[PDB]
Amino acid sequence: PPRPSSGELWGIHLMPPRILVECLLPNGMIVTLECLREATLITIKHELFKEARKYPLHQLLQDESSYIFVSVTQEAEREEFFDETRRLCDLRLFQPFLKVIEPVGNREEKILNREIGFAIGMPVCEFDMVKDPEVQDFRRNILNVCKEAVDLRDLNSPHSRAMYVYPPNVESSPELPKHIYNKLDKGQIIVVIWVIVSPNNDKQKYTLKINHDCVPEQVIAEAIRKKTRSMLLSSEQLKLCVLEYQGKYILKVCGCDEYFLEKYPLSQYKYIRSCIMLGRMPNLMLMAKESLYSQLPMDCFTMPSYSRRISTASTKSLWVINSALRIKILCATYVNVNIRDIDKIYVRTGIYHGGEPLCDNVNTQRVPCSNPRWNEWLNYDIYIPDLPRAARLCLSICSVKGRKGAKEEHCPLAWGNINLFDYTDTLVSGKMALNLWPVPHGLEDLLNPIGVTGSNPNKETPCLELEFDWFSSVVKFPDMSVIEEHANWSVSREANELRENDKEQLKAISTRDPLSEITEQEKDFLWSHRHYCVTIPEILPKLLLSVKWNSRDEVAQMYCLVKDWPPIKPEQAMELLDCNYPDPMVRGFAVRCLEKYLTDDKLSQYLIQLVQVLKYEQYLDNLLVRFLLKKALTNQRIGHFFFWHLKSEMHNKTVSQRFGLLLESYCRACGMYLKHLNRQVEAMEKLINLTDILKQEKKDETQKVQMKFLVEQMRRPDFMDALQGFLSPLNPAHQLGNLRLEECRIMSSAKRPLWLNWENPDIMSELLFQNNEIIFKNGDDLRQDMLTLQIIRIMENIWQNQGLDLRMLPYGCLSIGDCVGLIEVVRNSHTIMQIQCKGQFNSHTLHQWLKDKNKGEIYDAAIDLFTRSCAGYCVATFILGIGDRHNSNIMVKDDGQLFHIDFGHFLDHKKKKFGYKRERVPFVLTQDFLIVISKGAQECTKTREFERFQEMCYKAYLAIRQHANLFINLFSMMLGSGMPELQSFDDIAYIRKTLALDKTEQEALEYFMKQMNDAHHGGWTTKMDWIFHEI
Amino acid sequence: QDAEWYWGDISREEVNEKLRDTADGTFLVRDAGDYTLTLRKGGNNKLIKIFHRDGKYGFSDPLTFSSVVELINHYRNESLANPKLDVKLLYPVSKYQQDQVVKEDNIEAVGKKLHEYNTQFQEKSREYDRLYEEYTRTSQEIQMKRTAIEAFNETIKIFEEQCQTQERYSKEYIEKFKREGNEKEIQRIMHNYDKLKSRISEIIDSRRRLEEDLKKQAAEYREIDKRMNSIKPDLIQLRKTRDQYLMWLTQKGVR
Ligand SMILES: C[C@@H](Nc1ccc2c(c1)OCCn1cc(N3C(=O)OC[C@H]3C(F)F)nc1-2)C(N)=O
C-alpha cells in the first residue's frame, strides 16, 4: 500500500541526532551500530564491517564493497538500496534495521522500478500481484504508446530532444487582437539581446528594432546584421555568416528555462505577448546550441520485465438473446447501522448510461439489518439486445427510517457500480462479489452513477454477491460491420432541400447551453432531421441526448452518423467526454477531434479537466488515455502538470489503481525527467513532514519557539541537499536554487502556511526575478482555488482575444496531495487591510498609498491598470460566485494591479447552509475602490472614469455569456473529482442564473446592472443601444 | 385555471426533486402563454411543451383543445401511446400537501418557528461536519495502521530468516569449537542468537499491540459510521422543513 505519512520512522516524525540501527549480517549475526540521523549508507556500511570483525564468524564475511543494504520501507516493501549515497533519514524506513545481502537480479531494472515507485508513491511490485486481467493487459498494451513517442524523440536528434524537454510556450493562433497591434510601433517590437561574451564572460547588451512577426532564426539574422554595420561586410558575406550563427545559437528567456526552438512568429510566444501588453521591453539571450545539447542526455526506453514474460492465460452475439435482462442480488456480509434507529435495508438497483437511467429502477424486498439475505431475481424493463455498449449496473444498500409513519426517509449507506460489458466486449456472466465504497460527503441521492466502477480494494467493507444469467455461451457485443448492417435496414424500412424555419430552429438549438431544457417534441425534431445535421456539426451533443440509447435501432443509426460526422472545435469536443456521453464511439470521435485540432496551448490550459475525465471512462485502456499519455511523453510542459494532477489524487482509493498504472507508464518512458521529478517529490515530502510536526508536536508552542525549531531543522545537510537545486512544481521553466533561510517564516494565515524563498540560480536572474517565493500549505484543499484560478485565466484569454485589456492575475496554484498544495507569491503585493493599517484610516487611504508609489507620468498608468483589473474581477467573481470578499483577501500591487486571493468556495455553496435563493455580488465596489478609479472625487459614480469602468464590465459580462458553453462543460468535467461545492448538475445551474442564458441578450444586460445596483445602492445605468441586439 | 397539479413559476432544480425516485406516471405543469409538462418515463423527467395559438392548446399541431385543464384531464383518462411512449398521467404532485408542513397561520409565528429550525439545523450541520471529519481521519488512520501491520509481517519474516540463517551456519561450527575446546567462543554464538530472538519477541509484541489498537479503531469506525447513517435522515428532513418555512414567508410578502 502507499506510504502512511512523510515521517522518518513509524510513529516517529524525526529520528534523534543518534539512533541505534539493528544491522543483520549475512553470517546470521546481529550488530547494533549507533548511526547518525543524516549519515550516508556508504559510511554506515564502512563502520558496520569494522565492528563485524569483533562479532563471531567474521571469516565468512566477504569484502564490504560486494554488499548492499535491504530493509522494510513504510510502504511494506523489501526495498533494495543500490544508491548508497542516500542518507539514513531519507530512506523511509519502517523500523531502525538494515539487512546485508549481495546484489541479485537485474540491477538496472530494480533501480528504475524504485525510481518509478518513489514518484508514484506506492511500490511497482503491487501491480504484479493484481490478478485482474484488465490491469495486466493495460500494462502490456499501453507500452506501444510509450515507444511510439520515444522513437520520434530521438529521430531529429539533438533538436527533437530539446523540443521535448524545453517546448515552445506559444499561443493557439499567430493573429494579434486590435489593442495589442496598436501598442507595437508601426508593427515593430524593441528588444534587448543580453549575452555572456567570452573571454571575460561579461554581461553585454544591445537594442534591436525588429518586426513582430519574425521567426527566432530571423531575430538572430537581424542581430548579426546590426552588429556588422560598422565592419561594412558584403551582402553575400553577411548572409553566409548569418547561416552559421543561426545553426549554432538559439534564443532563451532571461531568468528562466524557456527557449525559442520551433519556427513560430516572435509575438505568438507568451513571454513576448505579455511584454507587449504590459509595455515592457523583452530580454532574450543567445545561448550556444552546444551548451544546451550537452546538458540534455539521451532518454532510453528499456522494455519492462512484465512485458517480456510468457502470458498466464462458443461465442454468441448480444442480438441473438431473445430474453429480458435480470440480475439476482444474493447477500451482503455486514452493514454498519443502528438497529434502534434504522428499521430495514434493501439493495436499490438501476441500469444506467452515464447519467440518464436506461430503465425504471428496481429494488429488492425489504429485509432487516441483522439478516441481509435477498436471493431475488430483479426484472428490468429493458430488452437485452437494446442494451448499448456503455451499459452499467449501479447499486447501493439503502436504509428506511419509518419512525414518523406518514413520511419514510430513505438514505444510502454503501454504493458500487459494475460495467455490464468488460474491456473485451464480453457481457458479464456467473457469480461476482463486489466490495462497496462509502457514500461521498453531501450525496443525498440513493444511487451514485457518476462514481467509479469496480470493487473496493479495502476488503474490510460491505461485500455484496450477485449472479448474472448464463445462456450456455460466451456473450459478446456485435462488431462494427454487424452494427452498420442493422442501421441500413432501419433507414430502408422508413423510406433534397429543407424548409428555412426548420433550419433556423436547428440553428437556435445548437447555440443553446449544454444544460438547457430540451423538449420531447424538440428531441423528435432532432432525430427526424438526423441526416440534415451534417451541415451544422456543432449540434451533435444536442442530437445525441435525443437518441433513445435503450433501443438498438436508434443506437446503430447514430453509430454510422458518428463515423462520417464532420470535425468540430476542441472546446465543443470536450463536451462529448463528460459523464453524460459514455458511448465509446462518441468518446472516440471527440478524442479524434482533439488529436487534429487541439493545440498544446489549449491542452495545457484545459489539462485539469481532461485528467478528471479519465475517471468517467469505463475501462483502463481507452483512446483518451493513449492521447493524453502520447502528448505527455512528447511535451515536458504538459507531462509535468499531467504527472502532478495524477500524483495529487493517489491518496484517493477510488482512482489509486487507474492513476497509479498510468503514472507507471509515464515514468517509464519520460526518461531524464523522472530523476528531476524525484527531486521535487523528495523536497515536497520533507515539507509535509516539517509542517506535520508544527501542527501535532509543537501545537501549543509560541511563534518564537516554532521559528527557532524551523531554522535549526532547515540548516541540517539532509534538508539543504533535498530543497536546493530542483525545479519548481508550480512552473517547470522556473528553477529553485539555494534557500534564503533568513526570509523563510511561518505565516499567521489559516492552517499556519510556511513561507519559502529560493535564490534564482539562472545566470541572468536580475532581468526577470531574483527571489522565487512560494507559500507551502498543508491543511486546506486547494482544488477549488486551482479550478477558480484556471477559469480566471480562460476568462482573461477570451477578453484579450476580443480586444479587452482587463489584466487579470491568475497566480500559480497546484494541489500535490491530500489537502497539500503550493501557492505562487505575487511580488510587491499587499492586502487592503495592510495598506489601511499603514495610514485609524480614511476611504482615500488606498488612493493616497497609490499616489506615493506611482508619481508623475506613471500615475495615469496605475489608475488605468487598477480600473482594468477591477472590472475583470467584478465580473469574474459575480459569475462564479466565490466566497464573500473582505479587506484581507483583496490584494493590490505597487503598480496598481488588483487581484483576489483565497477563493475557497464557488457557486451557491452557502445556499444549502442558509436557504436563501439569491445571486450575490461577492466583490462589492465600496467607496475605497471607487475613489481610486475616479482619481479622487466626491461624486464617484458621476465621472467619465466610472462610465468607462461600466462599459468594461458589460463588455466582459457578454464575452463570458457568448462562450458560456465552454465554462458549463469545464465545470461538468469536474463533477467526478469529489469536491463538496461541485457534485450534481444542480450546482452548475448557478452560473446559468448569473449569465442569464434563458433570458435574451438585452435582458442579460438589464439583469447585470440591476444586480450591481442592488449591491452598490445605485450608480449603474441603462443605455439606448441595448435594444438593438438580435434577441 | 389554478389546480393542484399546476405549480406556476418553479425552477428546474425543484422539478427534479419532486420527481426523484417516483413511479412512471408522476407529472407537473409550470410556466415557461406557454406551459411545460414533466412526465416520468423510465426514470427520466420527460419535458413535454404545451403550445398556445388563438385560444388553443396542445403538445403538437393540430391543436384540438380549448384549455390546459382539458388537455391534462384527457390524457389522465386516456393513454399517450402524441409520442410513442406507453405511459399516462396518473400521480399528480399537489401543492396543498406542502402547506401542511407550515402549520402556523400568522406571519409572526412562522418567523418564530423558522428561527428555531434554522438554529437547530446549524447545530445539526456542525455536528455532522465534525462527525464527518472524525469518520475521515479514522478511515485514514485505519489504512495507516493496516499498512504498518503488513510492514511488521515482512520485518518479522526477515528476522526469522536471520534466525534460520544463523541455525544453518552454527550447526557446522558448533562441532568445530567443541572438539577444539573453545567454550568462550561457543557462548558468544549462543548469546548472539538469544539477542536476535529477544528482538523478535519485541517486534511480535509491537505488532500484537497495534493489532489490538486496529481492532479497537475498527469498532470506533463502525460506531461513527452508525451515527453518520442515523444523523443524515434527520438533517435532510430538518433542512426540507426550514426551506418550506422560508418559502412561506416569500409567498406571504411583497413581490
Ligand atoms: C508578505 C506579503 N506578500 C504576500 C502575502 C500573501 C500572498 C502573496 C504575497 O502572494 C499573492 C498570492 N497569495 C495567496 C495567498 N493566500 C491564499 O490564497 O490563501 C491564503 C493565503 C496563503 F496563506 F495561502 N497569500 C498570498 C504580504 N502582503 O503580506
Ligand SMILES: [Cl-]
Ligand atoms: Cl475501513
